Write an enzyme that holds these catalytic residues in place. Structure first.
Site, short mmCIF file in Angstrom:
data_model
loop_
_atom_site.label_atom_id
_atom_site.label_comp_id
_atom_site.label_asym_id
_atom_site.label_seq_id
_atom_site.Cartn_x
_atom_site.Cartn_y
_atom_site.Cartn_z
CG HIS A 111 1.79 20.64 4.97
ND1 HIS A 111 2.12 21.11 3.72
CD2 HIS A 111 2.57 19.55 5.18
CE1 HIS A 111 3.07 20.36 3.21
NE2 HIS A 111 3.36 19.40 4.07
CG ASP A 142 -1.91 -1.15 1.21
OD1 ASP A 142 -2.62 -1.33 0.19
OD2 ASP A 142 -1.97 -1.88 2.22
CG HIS A 173 6.04 15.77 7.86
ND1 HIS A 173 5.52 16.89 8.46
CD2 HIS A 173 5.78 15.91 6.54
CE1 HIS A 173 4.98 17.68 7.55
NE2 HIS A 173 5.12 17.10 6.37
CD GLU A 174 7.14 13.63 3.39
OE1 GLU A 174 6.20 13.36 2.61
OE2 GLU A 174 7.55 14.78 3.58
CD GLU A 176 18.16 17.33 0.89
OE1 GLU A 176 18.89 17.89 1.73
OE2 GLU A 176 17.81 17.87 -0.17
CG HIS A 187 2.01 14.34 3.78
ND1 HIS A 187 1.07 15.32 3.99
CD2 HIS A 187 3.22 14.92 3.98
CE1 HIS A 187 1.68 16.45 4.32
NE2 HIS A 187 2.99 16.23 4.31
CG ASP A 214 6.84 11.86 -8.51
OD1 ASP A 214 7.61 12.76 -8.91
OD2 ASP A 214 6.83 11.47 -7.33
CG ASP A 260 15.00 20.67 -4.63
OD1 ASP A 260 15.02 19.58 -4.02
OD2 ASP A 260 14.75 21.76 -4.06
N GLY A 261 18.16 18.39 -5.96
CA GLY A 261 19.51 18.42 -5.44
C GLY A 261 19.46 18.62 -3.95
#
Ligand SMILES: CNC(=O)[C@@H](NC(=O)c1ccc(-c2ccc(NC(=O)c3cc4ccccc4o3)cc2)o1)C1CCCCC1
Ligand SMILES: [Ca+2]
Ligand SMILES: [Ca+2]
Ligand SMILES: [Ca+2]
Ligand SMILES: [Ca+2]
Ligand SMILES: [Ca+2]
Ligand SMILES: [Ca+2]
Ligand SMILES: [Zn+2]
Ligand SMILES: [Zn+2]
Ligand SMILES: [Zn+2]
Ligand SMILES: [Zn+2]
Lengths: 160, 165
Positions: free
Chosen positions: B129, B59, B119-120, B102, B123, B71, B76-77
């Protein structure tokens, strides 16, 4: 906190739809008629109305596509996923895509477009899958809208 | 007959997760402990159960990637977007993505994978948020654990309390 509210249903009773592209499997005419027919299914039993735009942005953007077609819910060649549609809402909401690796037909030789479309257009109207094998919204492919669906859609928008 | 759920959420209490690949910074073990702990944050306060698959389709697919990775939301580096996850739903619904440009850590220096993951996964379950600068679901990273009450009240509105003890 915030969650992700769902647009349970459309705000308005007047909805627009646009047929962006066309399957090679049926005349343009037959296609347009299959969809007009699939929208009548739900307009017959609700205050809902559908008018078709030829250009620009519509509430229900209809397209045919194969494999990856721009939303990352990619189709899968022939058989399997015939089509899919997004629930009511802004931007992508309500849109219907039909896997153009299936054979669409205005009858029985392949998957009847109108039937699949009418099914999908419930998903566009907020209808979830039904477990009643007689329900149009039953997940499996097989015109009078069955009471199971009439009740499901009316529960949202009310009668006509 | 069925109608769509008022809000985005999982239809079942039992959800599956798969760590599809691993970051170079931390060991396989650290990465799995951080994610197991990240999931426990949320199962502790709802009737949700999280099971891990080693292969196949879960899932919640978890992977690390850079820039363009499959996606509409390229990384972004280094710095900037740290990671993201999609709300409950089919396909990539519930999936979480971590930027491998990161530095991920199980400590303080760098970014704490557990905290970002917690945190993710919020989501993944249908939390957006918060505005509360002390809510786990507050968009901006901060290092420190007890799940803040805005987050608890947030997840429970979705899936109920589960066993309140
Ligand atoms: C550097 N770049 C960023 O930070 C960008 N952030 C992200 O992509 C991102 C994804 C997840 C988070 C994140 C934010 C807050 C916390 N929770 C906590 O830090 C936390 C720990 C804690 C401990 C106890 C109580 C409450 C708590 O909350 C955990 C993770 O941040 C962001 C910046 C802001 C604008 C969008 C782009
Ligand atoms: Ca198919
Ligand atoms: Ca639309
Ligand atoms: Ca074909
Ligand atoms: Ca980054
Ligand atoms: Ca998924
Ligand atoms: Ca790294
Ligand atoms: Zn699509
Ligand atoms: Zn369906
Ligand atoms: Zn991503
Ligand atoms: Zn976030």
């Amino acid at each position: 906190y915030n969650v992700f509210p769902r647009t349970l249903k459309w705000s308005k009773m007047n909805l627009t739809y646009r047929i962006v592209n066309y399957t090679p499997d049926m005349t343009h005419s037959e296609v347009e008629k299959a969809f007009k027919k699939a929208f009548k299914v739900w307009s017959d039993v609700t205050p809902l109305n559908f008018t078709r735009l030829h250009d620009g942005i519509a509430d229900i953007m209809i397209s045919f596509g194969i494999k990856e077609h721009g939303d990352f819910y990619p189709f899968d060649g022939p058989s399997g996923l015939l089509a899919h549609a997004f629930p009511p809402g802004p931007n992508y909401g309500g849109d219907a895509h039909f896997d153009d690796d299936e054979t669409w037909t205005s009858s029985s030789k392949g998957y009847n477009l109108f039937l699949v479309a009418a099914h999908e257009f419930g998903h566009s109207l907020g209808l979830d899958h039904s477990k009643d094998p007689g329900a149009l919204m039953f997940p499996i492919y097989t015109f009078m809208l069955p009471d199971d669906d009439v009740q499901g859609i009316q529960s949202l928008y009310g009668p006509g």
